[PDB]
Amino acid sequence: GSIMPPALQQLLQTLKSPNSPQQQQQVLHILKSNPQLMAAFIKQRSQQQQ
Numbered sequence: 578g579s580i581m582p583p584a585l586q587q588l589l590q591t592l593k594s595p596n597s598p599q600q601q602q603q604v605l606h607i608l609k610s611n612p613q614l615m616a617a618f619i620k621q622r623s624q625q626q627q
C-alpha cells in the first residue's frame with residue numbers, strides 16, 4: 578500500500594530538546610490529509626478537552 582510521512586517526527590523530539598521542522602515541514606499539507614497516522618499534528622490543531 579502507501580504510508581504517509583511521519584511529519585510528527587520532529588514533534589516528538591521537540592517534547593524534550595529543540596529540533597528543526599524536518600518531517601513536520603509543510604504542516605499545511607498535513608492538515609486534512611493524513612489524520613490517521615499524522616493524527617498528532619491534525620488532532621493537535623485546536624484540541625479543546627472537556
